[PDB]
Ligand SMILES: Cc1ccc(COP(=O)(O)O)c(/C=N/[C@@H](CC(=O)O)C(=O)O)c1O
Ligand SMILES: Cc1ccc(COP(=O)(O)O)c(/C=N/[C@@H](CC(=O)O)C(=O)O)c1O
């Protein structure tokens with residue numbers, strides 16, 4: 001049965017973990033997968049998470065299955081983060097949320113729900129985007145088409161190209177938008193641009209799917225949701241796949257949410273019964289631990305205050321690392337102007353290193369980035385900054 | 397986009413939770429979903445699990461992503477439970493295991509792996525079986541066909557009918573076998589029958605997929621795996637989807653495993669790279685908490701001893717409840733011979749109640765079973781036994 005199966009290529013992002021682990025050299029520097037590291041180059045459990053976990057250990061009295069859509073309080077806290085307290089979507093009961101195993105899980109649930117229950121055949125994704133978007137949608141049987149997004153010469157959102165790419169999208173196609181911290185470019189629409197896209201997609205009949213994996217890492221929780229809220233105000237229907245992996249440092253507990261929005265509560269409840277059927281046929285019901293930590297934190301004033309300050313701390317450290325990286329490249333002799341990096345949002349720097357420069361950085365210098373040239377700025381520290389920049393300068 | 401979506405039917409098993417929750421009557425009795433309850437009608441966290449969780453709280457220093465296939469020690473402990481310490485499959489490195497979100501997740505991963513990477517088009521499932529089997533395989537695009545299994549008149553495995561149903565299976569079809577505690581019938585092949593099926597499926601070219609959600613609930617961990625081991629000894633290739641939800645009481649943490657076996661290590665490693673690609677496109681990587689609890693327990697002599705005795709305790713309580721149920725039906729005037737129930741394996745009693753009797757038990761008596769007539773014996777207690785049996789007698 002299996003004699004003839006050809007090997008899959010290693011994953012361009014997660015596959016780096018294997019190579020990095022196998023590299024026995026001591027000065028290695030990991031700027032690959034999008035995890036946060038603190039000033040010591042560690043990814044600790046957040047203190048608010050440990051506190052919540054201690055509370056759960058003391059107070060949980062069963063592991064009985066959650067509902068297919070997960071913890072109700074988790075869904076309500078998620079909708080409030082996405083749409084804002086007092087949102088009409090919430091008041092009108094127009095949104096249903098399933099807790100999912102990670103943002104990836106939420107994208108797969110959305111895709112299977114769309115493929116089985118609507119006329120959707122194609123999803124439009126930005127070029128460039130996270131490489132696993134294509135894989136997830138294709139796995140559900142949906143075609144993926146790309147829309148232009150990035151002007152590499154000026155390091156800006158090429159809004160005219162984006163518009164004119166999307167003119168090929170038909171009514172009823174899905175268009176995927178990253179909510180904030182575009183991966184990999186770090187370049188987000190301004191609010192006015194978000195508003196322009198909202199009106200365009202209503203006019204053109206696109207179904208918006210927002211990916212929201214980095215809420216809080218661009219400017220802050222509420223500001224980062226402004227683009228999604230501009231869409232929510234204009235559309236009867238949309239879907240949001242959101243993750244708490246990064247903003248709670250809960251990567252391996254798989255905590256995400258798929259939120260379905262429709263014109264009214266009768267419609268969303270009917271549609272949502274098919275999303276639950278899709279989940280049941282996939283992983284049955286979602287893992288409680290990480291979601292219960294998030295719900296415990298978000299629903300407790302003290303834990304929430306601790307957590308929101310930890311999120312602010314991560315965002316500000318990454319911003320300090322952006323400045324230091326730009327400053328140190330200059331000092332180590334780069335010559336090129338890299339100041340555009342300071343303006344990028346989120347964990348990454350997309351600096352125009354070629355695939356061969358990235359390969360050379362790994363093989364010769366033990367510095368690990370993704371082949372697209374995406375670098376995890378959140379993996380930089382004052383101690384590894386000098387060697388990292390010396391290596392980059394050496395490959396330029 | 398969603399105006400026209402027709403509502404999904406509620407799930408025949410998980411949907412009971414909603415109805416039971418909404419039923420405001422005080423004497424309700426829950427014999428529906430397959431969770432264990434102790435003598436107080438509660439589903440507590442196992443003591444070995446709490447201990448492991450305390451250890452994790454004290455010792456975990458990151459939530460950084462696991463590999464796509466999860467915790468290595470978890471995979472190794474899983475293969476040892478399935479195949480036995482010293483198994484040739486293990487020595488020859490012929491098996492790869494991915495940790496998955498539950499047994500359901502492992503079945504979906506197997507199905508997507510098969511659909512995308514082999515010529516498999518059809519999976520054969522016993523009539524009756526767990527209703528979500530059909531849903532999972534169909535969601536991956538595979539057809540499901542049924543094979544005869546149960547002689548309801550004599551309450552036995554109708555082995556001749558099973559054989560003659562399966563003559564219609566082609567070489568290269570998958571045949572799904574429940575490892576032990578067949579759900580819903582509680583009727584398992586004897587070892588000699590397992591051995592006969594192993595030789596038959598090799599001869600006929602069927603790919604065996606074992607579902608193993610109840611290891612330890614029939615007779616014990618090792619005895620319950622004898623059928624799978626009879627298959628492993630005869631086949632070059634098979635897949636096992638196994639769950640730790642029930643035998644660790646970890647239902648909501650979603651702890652399962654998909655184990656792929658091929659003729660040699662080169663083949664299984666190549667095949668497994670495509671199973672990992674399928675996982676990446678689904679939920680990316682699996683939830684650490686429940687799996688890390690299982691690995692922590694299975695890899696520690698003291699915790700393992702505690703856990704194995706807790707598993708024995710659950711199995712023996714269910715066996716005491718089977719006897720008490722049969723005895724009490726007799727005392728409350730059933731008249732029918734129900735002694736066949738004592739011999740059934742696992743959590744359930746499949747007693748021949750009709751769908752209408754089950755509906756009447758819910759509506760009129762607040763007693764909740766599944767429409768197929770499956771009753772969760774693990775939900776019976778000395779205190780709820782009298783009322784439960786009075787209700788059943790009243791509907792006969
Ligand atoms: C745009 C986007 C959407 C969805 C995900 C996955 O989040 P999850 O862990 O499933 O909650 C990521 C995260 N990307 C990371 C890590 C990875 O590739 O798995 C990265 O790009 O390095 C992402 O960047
Ligand atoms: C044969 C079989 C295979 C797979 C599963 C799901 O296990 P998981 O929770 O995903 O690890 C169950 C469990 N069945 C239960 C609970 C349910 O239906 O979800 C039941 O039949 O009541 C099962 O009975």
Ligand SMILES: [Cl-]
Pocket residue numbers: 269
């Ligand atoms: Cl509902």
Ligand SMILES: [Cl-]
Pocket residue numbers: 665
């Ligand atoms: Cl490997």
